[PDB]
Design an enzyme around this catalytic site. Structure first.
Site, PDB file in Angstrom:
ATOM      1  N   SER A   1       1.209  -3.971  -2.145  1.00 22.22           N
ATOM      2  CA  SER A   1      -0.176  -4.013  -1.652  1.00 22.22           C
ATOM      3  C   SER A   1      -1.125  -4.502  -2.753  1.00 22.22           C
ATOM      4  O   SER A   1      -0.942  -5.603  -3.264  1.00 22.22           O
ATOM      5  CB  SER A   1      -0.597  -2.649  -1.117  1.00 22.22           C
ATOM      6  OG  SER A   1      -1.679  -2.772  -0.209  1.00 22.22           O
TER       7      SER A   1
ATOM      8  N   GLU B   1       3.586  -4.281   9.678  1.00 22.74           N
ATOM      9  CA  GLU B   1       2.586  -3.993   8.645  1.00 22.74           C
ATOM     10  C   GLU B   1       1.349  -3.283   9.194  1.00 22.74           C
ATOM     11  O   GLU B   1       0.988  -2.210   8.727  1.00 22.74           O
ATOM     12  CB  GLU B   1       2.152  -5.280   7.932  1.00 22.74           C
ATOM     13  CG  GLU B   1       3.208  -5.919   7.020  1.00 22.74           C
ATOM     14  CD  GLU B   1       3.285  -5.261   5.642  1.00 22.74           C
ATOM     15  OE1 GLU B   1       2.542  -4.291   5.379  1.00 22.74           O
ATOM     16  OE2 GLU B   1       4.084  -5.715   4.804  1.00 22.74           O
TER      17      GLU B   1
ATOM     18  N   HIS C   1       3.351  -0.719   6.713  1.00 21.05           N
ATOM     19  CA  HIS C   1       2.927  -0.967   5.359  1.00 21.05           C
ATOM     20  C   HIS C   1       3.073   0.360   4.573  1.00 21.05           C
ATOM     21  O   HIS C   1       2.598   1.391   5.045  1.00 21.05           O
ATOM     22  CB  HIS C   1       1.481  -1.474   5.380  1.00 21.05           C
ATOM     23  CG  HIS C   1       0.940  -1.822   4.036  1.00 21.05           C
ATOM     24  ND1 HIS C   1       1.424  -2.876   3.293  1.00 21.05           N
ATOM     25  CD2 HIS C   1      -0.040  -1.257   3.295  1.00 21.05           C
ATOM     26  CE1 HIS C   1       0.770  -2.940   2.146  1.00 21.05           C
ATOM     27  NE2 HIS C   1      -0.128  -1.971   2.124  1.00 21.05           N
TER      28      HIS C   1
END
Length: 566
Positions: free
Chosen positions: A214, A347, A467
């Site tokens: 990230s 995600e 995610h």
């Protein structure tokens, strides 16, 4: 976050402290650094492995007082032996569990780990840069425990860096020496430390891998883009992010003033007076009010964070981003090292929690004009060309007559992650020596082992691989437990850490010594490829065409009449 996850986390915090005491040994050791001697301790894991642990190694002067918002400086060396048997504090940040502010401005340290301080050969060095949108995160072992990686014969290094306004304030006025990207400049100097000191821990200074997820992936990419780090490392892994993600940079030069005003500043909008107030404000006051800085127009235009990496307004000695990231890819030294990139199979599922609070967001997909790339869209998002572009997005994710939360979360996957990856790959291809880039898709779903981000995304009892679901299989955290060695989760730990260490070692992720990989032919991506191939990681490992490719090209067609901006 709920009152239940607050008491629950309070308990695991108390448990993690007793477990961490329990898992400590009496075996202290001393290592050399160019700043002086450091004392580490040997620790234990729930799989009955052990490792040497060096925590709270300073790689910069504490950025307090007059150094606040400034580039980092080298720390002061010491005689004697510095105690590194305990973690230091995290960067000042809002605790996602409690909502209270925690951390300290004295936060610029790194941690070093290895199962063997005196290996018979120099080892691959893996440097992890945590994510957290540049506003949260830490290198504490209750979140990023080295326990899975030290089963392998590498040296693992987890760094910290300044977050939020303290990390990324930016002022136009060239006299005040606050260009921006302080927090990135922290990362650079940590790399310079790792380069000059990993050898003292059995690391190979000529075989260093930086990776992150990230905001940590964006960071890793930045370290590959900037001139400041040329030649410092040799492999990169970009996990669910990079620097041309729309959330990975922002022009925030005007937002300093607004922050000062939220914190009680009285006076005019000029940088000097703004800076002077910000320089003497309590740190936790500034951090606590950061949530309020973005205007409603900016939130509308999908600006995710008020302060973050930015094109610096002028060049100084430690400048990191002199141009927009798209421009820097064109000369980046990092294009010419072996690179792995990837995302998870769902995600945007991360945005479940946000939708739960704002169900009105799902209606944004009626025209999708808000998700048009900002450089292409008009201010009000009302121009007929913008409605046109929004229509293309809408066709890609709205499955029925009315959009759903799933359509929404599916779109986010692309807006925030897959589309930027695509743009980066194509830009890189026109500017690279020909070093391979490999793709993975993380697709392993499990509820039997989790990490703390699942508490924040409210991912409890939610199917699909969100995610941050992959971190669980890389690092130990205080919500983990020992898993049977025959379990699918344990295997995934073995594969994930196996592939990463293999890539770190050779610049090639394939090993036949990793279970499940016997039929795998993992080819890198070529410029001539119309379709991306990736290693899809689930209960089995399988090479496939990236499933997201069709929607990815839909987004790219938004740039049909503006190919120079792609």
């Amino acid at each position: 976050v709920s009152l239940m996850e607050k008491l629950k986390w309070k308990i695991k915090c108390i448990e993690n402290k007793f477990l961490n005491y329990r898992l400590t040994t009496n075996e202290t050791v001393v290592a050399e650094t160019e700043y002086g001697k450091v004392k580490g301790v040997k620790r234990l894991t729930v799989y009955d492995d052990s490792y040497y642990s060096f925590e709270g190694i300073p790689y910069a002067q504490p950025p307090v007082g007059e150094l606040r918002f400034k580039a980092p400086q080298r720390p002061t060396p010491w005689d004697g032996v510095r105690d590194c048997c305990n973690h230091k504090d995290k960067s000042v940040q809002v605790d996602f569990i409690t909502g209270k502010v925690c951390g300290s401005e004295d936060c610029l340290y790194l941690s070093v780990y290895t199962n063997n301080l005196n290996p018979e050969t120099k080892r691959p060095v893996l440097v992890y840069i945590h994510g957290g949108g540049f506003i949260i995160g830490e290198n504490h072992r209750d979140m990023y425990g080295p326990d899975y990686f030290i089963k392998k014969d590498v040296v693992l290094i987890n760094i910290q860096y300044r977050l939020g306004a303290l990390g990324f304030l930016s002022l136009n006025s060239e006299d005040l020496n606050v260009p921006g990207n302080a927090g990135l400049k922290d990362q650079v100097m940590a790399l310079r430390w790792i380069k000059n000191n990993c050898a003292n821990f059995g690391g190979n200074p000529d075989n260093i891998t930086v990776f992150g997820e990230s905001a940590g992936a964006a960071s890793t990419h930045y370290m590959m883009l900037t001139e400041q780090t040329r030649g410092l490392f040799h492999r990169g892994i970009l996990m669910s992010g990079n620097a041309i993600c729309p959330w990975a940079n922002t022009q925030c030069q005007h937002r300093a003033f607004t922050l000062a005003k939220l914190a009680g500043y009285k006076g005019e909008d000029n940088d000097k007076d703004v800076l002077e107030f910000l320089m003497k404000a309590k740190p936790q006051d500034l951090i606590k009010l950061e949530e309020k800085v973005l205007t409603l127009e900016e939130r509308t235009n999908k600006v995710m964070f008020p302060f973050g990496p930015t094109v610096e307004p002028y060049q100084t000695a430690d400048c990191v981003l002199p141009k927009h990231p798209r421009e820097m890819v064109k000369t980046a030294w990092g294009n010419s090292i072996p690179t792995m990139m990837g995302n998870t199979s769902y995600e945007g599922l991360f945005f479940t929690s946000i939708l739960k609070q704002m169900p009105l967001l799902v209606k944004e997909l009626e025209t999708c004009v808000n998700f048009v790339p900002s450089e292409l869209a008009d201010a009000e998002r009302t121009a007929p060309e913008t409605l046109e572009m929004g229509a293309k997005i809408k066709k890609a994710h709205v499955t029925g007559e009315t959009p759903t939360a799933d359509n929404f979360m599916d779109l986010c996957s692309h807006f925030y992650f897959w589309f930027p990856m695509h743009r980066l790959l194509q830009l890189r291809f026109n500017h690279t020596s020909g070093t391979p880039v490999y793709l993975y898709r993380f697709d392993f779903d499990s509820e039997d082992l989790i990490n703390p981000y699942r508490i924040m995304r409210s991912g409890r009892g939610v199917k699909g691989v969100s995610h941050t679901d992959e971190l669980t299989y890389f690092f130990w955290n205080q919500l983990a437990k020992r898993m049977p060695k025959e379990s699918r989760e344990y295997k995934t730990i073995e594969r994930m850490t196996g592939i990463w260490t293999q890539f770190a070692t050779t610049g090639n992720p394939y090993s036949n010594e990793i279970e499940g990989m016997e039929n795998v032919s993992w080819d890198p991506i070529e410029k001539s490829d119309e379709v991306y191939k990736c290693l899809n990681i689930s209960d089995e490992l399988k090479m496939i065409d990236v499933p997201e490719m069709g929607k990815i090209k839909q987004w790219e067609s938004m740039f049909e009449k503006h190919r120079d901006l792609f």
